[PDB]
Design a protein around this ligand. Structure first.
Ligand SMILES: O=c1ccn([C@@H]2O[C@H](COP(=O)(O)OP(=O)(O)OP(=O)(O)O)[C@@H](O)[C@H]2O)c(=O)[nH]1
Length: 460
């Protein structure tokens, strides 16, 4: 940039109240000066003032979702569960199923230097979360091929962000895309936003770098349009989309039961929950808030509401639908994004950010739920120990960490083997079962009668 191009950009920022981002220009080495110029040209400071103004200058009725919107792997008719599986697999076979992996988050409490998906939780195989999830895609495709005779494809749209993008692209590349075909793995970006003070002033990471953060998991909807991903899905003939977080080590990627369940209710949005078993669990819950599908924080649930027993089922809680951020969307729903993408608010996330101190402005993925007709919303309860194991904290926390994650995968593996007639001997811990061997506990008949000495790794 010329001196006059630079000064034009300094004026735009100063006029917007944000001129302090050039405060250290005098001491910058031209290359650094060039970087700040380009980074600052990607943001409109007026738009940032808008979002910051709405964010900083802005008793519900709670009922569970209606019986007609809900199901349970635990309680539903196994006949339904099996029909849903069979039908969901058919949609996979038809190449109608896509996955969006939400992998743009910075993960600032596990505090890895790498993207969370690269994390090695300590399994015998030493596989990353990325690889495990990819092998589930691979395995499910081969399962679908059995019934159809034809190749099945589930496109894997990996949503990253600025801080996550490049190292994720390099990791997938080094790992030869985990045995999937390149064309079927699509890495894309959500937008980022500068982090702001309590007074809405842009925060500086360095003298020549603005502190940025991804704009929330809710930024997914806009990012589908911007990245060109929704229209890629159009070309591919996608009709059904499964979306989850990279941190879930137990994720049933493109779960046919979930797809088959959602498709048969002809809903636009479905969700997975696990069971809340004790009233004191600090878990966000899916329910109707003011006659509308929503996710409500645990703090907003009074003692009496949390404690209430289900009248139709007195041994379990009335409000028990613990949110695991695991969603289905119809393609029809994705074509409606323009009509409401602007109706999603940026929330104030007070985090520790530079040169809790700051704010990250974030959209919430579930904020579209109350905008969605109750008749277009579904929810299925699943088994935690088969489906939900978040990597959220560093080792030594005792909760949602590498060890709980490893435990969850390795005790699943053992249990799967034991159900198939396998004899697991632990003179020592569990057994790691490769998704390339078993997606969901099937195809282990060959282990009947065999002694496996734990800890162990069953691989192709
Ligand atoms: O791909 C994603 C995923 C999540 N997020 C956003 O991250 C916010 C933080 O919550 P997360 O649940 O994503 O935890 P994290 O791994 O980011 O860990 P921390 O940074 O909180 O220490 C969530 O509210 C979501 O909106 C994204 O921006 N992009």
């Amino acid at each position: 940039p010329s001196a006059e191009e630079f000064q034009q950009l300094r004026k735009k920022y100063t006029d917007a109240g944000q001129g302090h981002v050039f405060a250290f220009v005098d001491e910058l080495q031209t290359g650094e000066r060039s970087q700040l110029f380009h980074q600052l040209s990607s943001f409109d400071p007026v738009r940032i003032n808008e979002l910051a103004d709405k964010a900083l200058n802005p008793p519900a009725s709670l009922e569970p979702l209606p019986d007609i919107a809900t199901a349970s792997i635990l309680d539903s008719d196994p006949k339904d569960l099996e029909q849903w599986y069979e039908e969901g697999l058919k949609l996979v076979a038809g190449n109608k199923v896509a996955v969006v992996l939400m992998a743009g988050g910075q993960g600032t409490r596990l505090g890895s230097s790498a993207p969370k998906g690269c994390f090695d939780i300590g399994l015998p195989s030493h596989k990353s979360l990325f690889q495990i999830q990819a092998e589930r895609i691979a395995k499910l495709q081969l399962l679908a091929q059995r019934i159809s005779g034809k190749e099945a494809v589930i496109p894997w749209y990996v949503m990253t962000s600025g801080p996550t993008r490049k190292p994720t692209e390099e990791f997938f590349e080094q790992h030869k895309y985990f045995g999937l075909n390149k064309s079927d793995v699509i890495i894309f970006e959500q937008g980022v936003l500068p982090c702001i003070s309590n007074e809405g002033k842009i925060l500086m990471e360095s003298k020549f770098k603005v502190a940025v953060a991804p704009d929330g998991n809710g930024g997914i909807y806009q990012a589908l349009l911007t990245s060109g991903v929704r229209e890629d899905m159009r070309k591919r003939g996608i009709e059904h989309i499964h979306t989850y977080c990279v941190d879930n080590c137990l994720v049933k990627v493109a779960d046919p039961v979930f797809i088959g369940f959602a498709a048969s209710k002809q809903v636009d949005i479905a969700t997975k929950v696990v069971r809340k078993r004790n009233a004191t669990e600090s878990v966000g819950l899916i329910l109707q808030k003011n006659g509308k599908p929503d996710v409500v924080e645990y703090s907003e649930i009074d003692k009496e509401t949390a404690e209430a027993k289900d009248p139709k089922q007195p041994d379990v809680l009335k409000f028990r639908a613990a949110n695991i951020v695991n969603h289905y969307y119809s393609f029809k729903f994705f074509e409606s994004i323009e009509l409401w993408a602007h109706k999603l608010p940026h929330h104030v996330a007070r985090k520790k950010i530079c040169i809790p101190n700051g704010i990250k402005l974030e959209q919430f993925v579930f904020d579209v739920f109350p905008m969605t007709p109750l008749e277009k919303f579904a929810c299925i309860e699943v088994r935690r120990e088969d489906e939900f194991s978040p990597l959220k904290n560093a080792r030594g926390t005792g909760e949602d960490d590498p060890d709980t994650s490893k435990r969850d995968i390795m005790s699943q593996g053992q249990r799967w083997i034991e159900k198939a007639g396998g004899i697991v001997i632990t003179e020592g811990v569990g057994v790691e079962v490769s998704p390339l061997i078993s997606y969901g506990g099937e195809g282990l008949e060959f282990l009947k009668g065999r002694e496996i000495k734990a800890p162990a790794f069953i691989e192709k």
